[PDB]
């Protein structure tokens, strides 16, 4: 039943960059809860102040490492700080330096580990995520020759010079002038994961090299937060209430949160979808909240419309997950026009609180959306987008009830003990795998 | 201790061709009886219709692949049908169609081991047995990274195209044209193992090739279902009532169970050996039964000696065990003169129930038949096979109920809970093998 | 844990010749008290009586293996005889001879192996010390592909023609036309171990090619033996008695137990520091018992002082080890010169009797004696050790009775029991281990 896993990540909570700090240690926490002992190994970035262990050669030059220690049940954690490990910024400094503080995160992790074994057994396996970590989990995999779960949460797709390879020790890995630490990590893996099934399909170019030993393992959401309780009155009540705040009047409410860039998340499209429906009669009947900021020429084409049309309105700001929730519980849909998605968490989060989601079918959306829990679409087709809206709209004046509890029913079935409780399958080979020629 | 088996056979009861399927059904309960969960795999052939469990590409068209589940204790048995699987000629149908059989029975295992990965863990060991089942025991050693277990029942002695291989999605192991899937099985394997000690000895020409890793696992017999406590009354009185059910009077029986062929079972050599003693005078003072089919010249000539002698008796059909069993407590000897013999199954069978073997000395025979236990004679010689049929009138007159004594507490001890207690030390290498160096 | 250890060694008591012997018999029944089932394979050397189990080929040539059994609780000993096996000089008979010997102990080994597991499971780790069980260690790992540790005891520093790891089945590990064996038993290792942190730091140069599979066990010393209990009257009493036997007054008696022409124990190094003494003040307290026999102009130099000095008492008999454990709880202090020492057992000896060790800082010596414990000296320099004599009469104040209640309590921490647990850990590789980058 029982095991002792080695998690490393390169960022871990209250470290928070993206989404993955949360992510990992919810992960974490997950298998802490099942009765597994969880090792976790990352980097302080300056946040911690830790304790000196000992030293090691890197770059050719020494270097202290430090270590700050937490308990919490069966989760312990590491925090390894020295050299390039307390830079503050957490990717970086720079392209040279992030490679740089990824390769002492290896070496640091071994002496960590091989300081434990002097009092305590070797790891079941190591789990490790992302190519940040993949010098760490190869050096961990040759020397100590354990299993190895390689996750990657999102491609990035960019080769690194070989130099970076030798000084890690791991020579042998670098065959040529430039490599894929994606593809380093996969190949050293017994078992490959990614965070959704259609993300895994979409990508199946890369994720091929690794059939047979590539999986699906899906992310969870945090339902306890993500939930209806802490919203008071009924949904008419708080979407009439919401719209006043906003300086708008009863309509069928469309809302889209995310950054404002090119071929991502698909504000563009979105925009454009705004501009087609401009000349239709049922324009007048939709209201559209549009949340976020970036690239400042889609801010200014967002604030054109706002300034164009009264049913929309354009916020520029971080807005806090307690007013987000209350959205999300007052809203009809939302929008997700994204040209990629690995998991989709913003389609759970609003599933969760009612919204009804009207998203691209890319990479996990497909998997988390289905045909009585909202609509899909072509992505990158504004045109598509807007008579997707217009469908919205006709559904709308049927009792959608029936549609909402089955989003909430369904986003409250990606937990993080199932995702949990399927790493552990992943961890022994027990478990399911892409294989090319299953139709 | 205790282990989860995946066994991969082509033939199962109640699929009967040869006694393989025997085989492969008592070593699966024998492993079951001792404790350990038994998954088998197997083409349903027909003879099974099941449900779809999904589709496959194999050679280029999709193939909807089904199961038939039974469980019988620990015993799991899984009937895969789907494209030629469905074929109801085990063997074929013929030379090409028998290898994408084999092929195909090898995508759609890895699909069905995938899915049940999905709720269960990973089997221990795979145990695949002839060639027939090396598509399947590759792939799965391929991607899954089992320990695999090759068992050799019969040496085929051929090569397949390397097109079979590539479609298979084991380019890898075809390294030229045409390709032994015997040599690629055993390469493949972590321990190999044939059915005699004797077999070995005689094929060590090609089973050398895997010297340090290759070692004998002998068959055993079900004596608690061959056994004289399903007939009745005393043995001369079944004698005489089975003479006389063919039109006979009595007299001492001699009895043949094998396919008509030219250089396997050698019922070419007994037809010859009957022709040189019905020019003697002890012809008409004895009885033959010869079992039977196949070769359609060998065919004739058996029924040709029908026709001519009223001595001899052929049955064409296919015969039940209850029946076989009947007929080997009745028969005084039986007559087992092939040119090569993996085994003899049909020895132990006729040794537990009563009846004297006269055996060619060749492979499993030479272990299982002694001296005071039937008579060995030189194979693929119709002259000492004759001279050994008067050796056996001379004994009809003494009292040889030793011979069957000796027969009976001799067969019962080539127990299936033997063999199985010996293939589970083959599964993790705890068990002795051949060596060059070792004389 | 409960593993079953297979241990190979190339001496083990009765037959004597370093003391590798003694060593390995206490690693033996250390794991076997500590609840493991040991099995040693050893060569008979032409000793004890065995049965034939068997025949191998080596060198063209049929040889009649056999073995003695003797079975000590959870400890199993077989000792192989046949062939070169036979030969009663342990490292011999010759150099050639010896590799043939070392190359027909592989093979035999093997054989036996192969008998045994006809019976019995295969164990769980495969222990083997020393270059001249290279050949049994590799050709287990080869076939049956148990876990392998290699044990470095003392570094040979030679290399063997490749003729002899073609004619042991190894043509493999032989790619250039001469192969150092002790190289080529880390290579097949899968961890890597040496009797002590200070030997593998000084042999560092050999250590660092299995950079991260090479750490230290520690030897221990059985102090239910080495123990003041037995010894009868207070300290002062006995020397005081040991003193008028040989021949002297009261004074600060050292000595010196060591095998003369045995060079690596500086002798000769102590010879001239008497001399440098000789002349000075002091030496009229200084009382000194050199032990041992060898070169006849050692043994002059040693009687030609003993001649001069009334001081200087030198035996050359063989002494009993009852006698040796009373000069060691009598003397004041024990003198050990040696060049270089992978452990240092004398100096365990002393100290778990109350001797307090003057040694030199090589090897092993530097972990065992600390400046709580005893006084560390410059190898090979005569000045030095004067000068550390010296410095013992200044400590001869009274206070060096916390040095010998010091000496006997981290004596007494180097025990067998504490060895056997931490190559039980090198067993599963679950140990710390020495790597280049860690400073
Ligand atoms: O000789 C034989 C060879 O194959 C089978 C074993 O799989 C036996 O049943 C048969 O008697």
């Known amino acids: ?11 871990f909570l209250p470290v928070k960059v993206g989404g993955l700090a949360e992510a990992l240690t919810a992960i974490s926490e997950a298998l802490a809860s099942l009765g597994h002992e969880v090792l976790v190994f990352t980097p302080s970035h300056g946040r911690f102040q830790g304790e000196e262990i000992g030293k090691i050669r890197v770059f050719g030059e ?9 308990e919490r049940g069966n989760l312990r954690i590491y925090r390894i700080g020295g050299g390039l490990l307390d830079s503050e910024d957490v990717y970086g400094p720079g392209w040279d330096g992030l490679i740089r503080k990824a390769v002492t995160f290896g070496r640091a992790s071994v002496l960590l580990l091989n300081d434990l074994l002097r009092e305590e057994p070797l ?6 995520h992302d190519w940040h970590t993949v010098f760490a989990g190869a050096l961990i995999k040759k020397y100590f020759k354990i299993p190895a779960v390689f996750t990657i949460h999102r491609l990035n797709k960019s080769k690194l010079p070989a130099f970076y390879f030798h000084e890690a020790g791991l020579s042998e890995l670098a065959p040529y002038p430039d490599i894929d630490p994606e593809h380093t990590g996969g190949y050293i893996a017994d078992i490959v994961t990614t965070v959704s099934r259609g993300y895994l399909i979409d990508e199946w170019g890369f994720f091929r090299n690794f059939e047979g030993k590539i999986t699906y393992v899906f992310n969870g959401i945090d339902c306890s937060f993500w939930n209806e309780s802490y919203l008071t009155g009924s949904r008419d009540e708080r979407k009439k209430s919401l719209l006043s705040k906003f300086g708008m009047d009863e309509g069928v409410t469309f809302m889209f949160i995310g950054r404002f860039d090119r071929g991502q998340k698909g504000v563009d499209v979105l925009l454009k979808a705004i501009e087609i429906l401009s000349s239709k009669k049922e324009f007048q009947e939709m209201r559209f909240i549009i949340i976020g900021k970036g690239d400042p020429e889609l801010e200014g084409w967002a604030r054109s419309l706002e300034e164009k049309h009264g049913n929309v309105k354009v916020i520029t700001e971080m807005l806090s997950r307690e007013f987000v929730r209350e959205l999300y519980g007052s809203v009809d849909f939302v929008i997700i026009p994204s040209y990629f998605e690995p998991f989709g968490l913003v389609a759970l989060e609003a599933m969760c609180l009612g919204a009804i989601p009207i998203a691209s079918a890319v990479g996990g959306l497909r998997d988390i959306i289905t045909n009585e829990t909202g609509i899909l679409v072509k992505a990158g087709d ?8 217009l469908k919205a709209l006709e559904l709308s004046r049927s009792d959608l009830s029936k549609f909402r509890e089955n989003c909430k029913k369904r986003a409250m079935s990606f937990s993080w003990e199932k995702s949990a409780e399927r790493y552990v399958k992943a961890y022994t080979g027990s478990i399911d795998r892409a294989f090319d020629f299953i139709l």
Chains 1, 2, 3 share one sequence.
């Open 1 to 11: 039943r029982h095991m002792k896993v080695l998690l490393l990540g390169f960022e």
């Open 382 to 389: 504004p045109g598509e987008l807007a008579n997707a809206i």
């Open 123 to 128: 790891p079941d396996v190591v789990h490790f």
């Open 62 to 70: 020494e270097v202290q490492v430090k270590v700050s220690y937490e």
